């Protein structure tokens, strides 16, 4: 079976991709299971389906197990939408420089071309050390689907 | 020498669990101990028959799985049969024997029974997901990752039948046997029963539930679900098997029964622990047998490992034993699904002329 | 020596029915002798719990009987309670070392297992008649009349599990044991084996069936109907229980499973027909102490053991043994019940001138 990855291109199904993710969001996490997140997805495969869809649907799964008895959930399933919000702006999970981002997206009538006419490129690259964007792993579910939404 | 039928009048009641006076009259209205008699009764309860199970869908579930999902279940299946096969004869065999009340002869006798029904429940499961049952049979006494453990679990009950009809035969002392010497310990069959007891409660309490996790995992994916359904009423009973078990050696490590058992029991401590290791080394070493291929939605090397190493805390924690691995949270908390089972409108103003704005 | 599971892996169809290699995987795609996995599921399929079954009338009606005819059911009643007291533990524990092919092993222990049930339904009805079962239970070890008729049974259960252990531990052979010499025959123990099957069939077929007579006689009068009802279920898996020991004891008469066991059947067949001369005969004299103080509409002592004389001659004849008694008619044919289950107007005067007067 094949999946539609991202960019366009299809690989030979592998679930070893889905625990890589969600050994990931779930590392340092109390009481969440792996297991419950793939099983309570009830993920239909099909020949093409897209890789962006799959995931969508674990971070679903993810946010609907929270709870009394498991509350980290809320963090699972916000670090995994927040990997999700990565590649929906950026095509990857690493975040562009904040000089070439405020361009593409002045250019694009996103930004307030303001932005531009205020802070030199040297001033831009000063406020990306201010930047951590680790800080993106500190929110809660509930957070980043305000964020996203 | 054992007799079916004791001629002596004895107090039932004040008889050791084990190595008394064999029992004559099988009587139920009272007990020494009424544990038992509260798990024939929870038993003969839960009666069921394989065919009464609708599996003809998961024929077709089976052959739809992946090459290496068939290669999971069909494993989880012949060593499940094995283990069943084991415990179909073994506790009438090596128990029997040495039972002296009447309430735990009848349990043992009820727990090997509803062991049978297991047997032929995996006799209906193969014959209904595979073509030729004969290929799945035929390869439990070949396969190398079964017989290895299928000859370490057989040989505590091999041991204890042993040294019990040298018990019998001879009497306690020591003897010779074709210019051979040979001495019979009551304080060693005792020994051999207890480890043979923590054998068993490995047996059904963990590499069983280990197995549980894989016929349960492919239920959560709606897949080989006739299985799930006797799996289910399969522990259901694995439940009270192992409770059977640990009342036992609880019994006997606690010195209630017998005073002497209970030194016995501390200097098999260490033996039992490592026992008990042993078995979750062989599991774990099984689910990376299982998963050699490829992994399924829900279960890994490491999920199932991860179970393995849960569970085992659990249980020997319940029978005295020092806990081996780390304290951990439940792996797969969902197999705990499948282990147990317009106003009232009037105003009072002199009430509110009672306060000040 | 036994091994609860052995490494060999045999065609268990190839197998004989005891002796050789001890089973290792049950599987139940396929039987060497269909009969016995016939016999588990139908023995499954009549699977009863006592307590589901009325006896609360039963009280009242026991003691409202006289002292006499309470004497002949509570007497009854403890018989009864003794041999399947044997027949619960004895199949598993005197047959089990033995069998080599997987749809007997299942067997036997679903046979022994039914029989425990039975040792339920009487604690059942005693608790339920009288006021203290303890002393209904305790009489059933000091009475002359009952202790007397275990030793019989028992002898030939005990006599096949102790050669089997030698034969376990020592195999075949001149052995010497303690300044003793003994030896060790195989053809005796397969001597042995025929002998305790027949002693069991004797038990099954003939002395429970006296006392299924005395069960439903006080039925037939429409007392004690809840016992009946009891009984008439135990006396159904009775059925099918002499139908084992009987299909066994004629494959192995017949030297079809073991050739060697043909020539040995020959040599006990004046064993076998003395032990159930002898057995009918220990009946009659278990109907002299049922009536030593009076009798019943329906039933005496010369009425019993008429159906002593007359249920033996079916049963030895059925295992290929000369008749003992006179041929009889049933003399108590009710017992059968409970063991299985305008004119038309028109005239043709033309046709009545075809006619001369
Ligand atoms: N071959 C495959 N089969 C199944 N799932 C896959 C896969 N490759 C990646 N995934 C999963 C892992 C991620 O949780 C999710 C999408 O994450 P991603 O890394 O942004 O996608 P991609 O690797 O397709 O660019 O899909
Ligand atoms: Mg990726």
């Known amino acids: 079976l094949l999946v539609t990855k991202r960019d366009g291109s299809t690989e030979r199904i592998n679930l070893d991709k889905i625990h890589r993710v969600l050994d990931w969001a779930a590392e340092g996490l109390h009481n969440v299971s792996i297991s419950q997140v793939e099983l309570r997805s009830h993920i239909q495969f099909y020949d093409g389906i897209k890789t962006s869809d799959i995931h969508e649907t674990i971070i679903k799964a993810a946010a609907d197990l929270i709870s009394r008895d498991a509350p980290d959930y809320q963090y699972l399933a916000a670090r995994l939408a927040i990997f999700h919000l990565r590649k929906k702006a950026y095509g990857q999970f690493e975040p562009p420089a904040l000089y070439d981002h405020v361009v593409k997206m002045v250019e694009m009538g996103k930004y307030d071309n303001h932005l531009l006419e205020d802070y030199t490129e040297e001033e831009f690259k000063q406020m990306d050390t201010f930047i951590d964007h680790d800080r993106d792993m500190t929110f809660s579910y509930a957070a980043v689907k305000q964020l996203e939404g | ?357």
């Open chain 2, 1 to 357: 020498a054992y007799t079916t039928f004791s001629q002596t009048k004895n107090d039932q009641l004040k008889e050791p669990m084990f190595f008394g006076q064999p029992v004559n009259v099988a009587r139920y209205d009272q007990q020494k101990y009424d544990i038992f008699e509260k798990l024939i009764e929870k038993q003969l309860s839960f009666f069921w028959r394989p065919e009464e199970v609708d599996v003809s869908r998961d024929r077709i579930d089976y052959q739809a799985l992946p090459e290496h999902e068939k290669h999971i279940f069909i494993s989880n299946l012949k060593y499940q049969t094995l283990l069943d096969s084991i415990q179909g004869r073994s506790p009438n065999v090596a128990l029997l024997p040495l039972i002296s009340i009447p309430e735990l002869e009848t349990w043992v006798e009820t727990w090997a029974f509803s062991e049978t029904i297991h047997s032929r429940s995996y006799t209906h499961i193969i014959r209904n997901i595979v073509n030729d049952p004969s290929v799945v049979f035929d390869d439990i006494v070949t396969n190398e990752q079964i017989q290895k453990r299928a000859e370490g679990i057989s040989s505590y009950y091999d041991e204890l039948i042993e040294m019990t009809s040298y018990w019998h035969l001879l009497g306690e002392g020591t003897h010779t046997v074709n210019g051979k010497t040979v001495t019979v310990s009551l304080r060693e069959l005792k020994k051999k029963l207890y480890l043979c007891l923590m054998s068993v409660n490995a047996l059904e309490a963990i590499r069983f539930y280990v197995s549980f996790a894989c016929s349960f995992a492919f239920a959560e994916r709606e897949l080989m679900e006739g299985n799930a359904k006797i799996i289910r009423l399969i522990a259901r009973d694995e439940a009270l098997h192992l409770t059977g078990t640990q009342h036992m050696l609880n019994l006997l490590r606690s010195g209630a029964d017998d005073p002497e058992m209970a030194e016995i029991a501390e200097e098999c401590k260490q033996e039992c622990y490592d026992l008990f290791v042993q078995a979750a080394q062989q599991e774990k070493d099984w689910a990376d047998y299982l998963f050699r291929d490829g992994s399924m939605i829900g279960l890994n090397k490491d999920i199932l490992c991860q179970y393995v190493e849960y569970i085992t805390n659990i249980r020997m924690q319940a029978v005295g034993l020092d806990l081996p691995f780390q304290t951990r949270s439940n792996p797969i908390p969902w197999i705990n699904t499948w282990l147990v089972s317009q106003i009232d409108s009037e105003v009072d103003t002199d009430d509110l002329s009672n306060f000040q704005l």
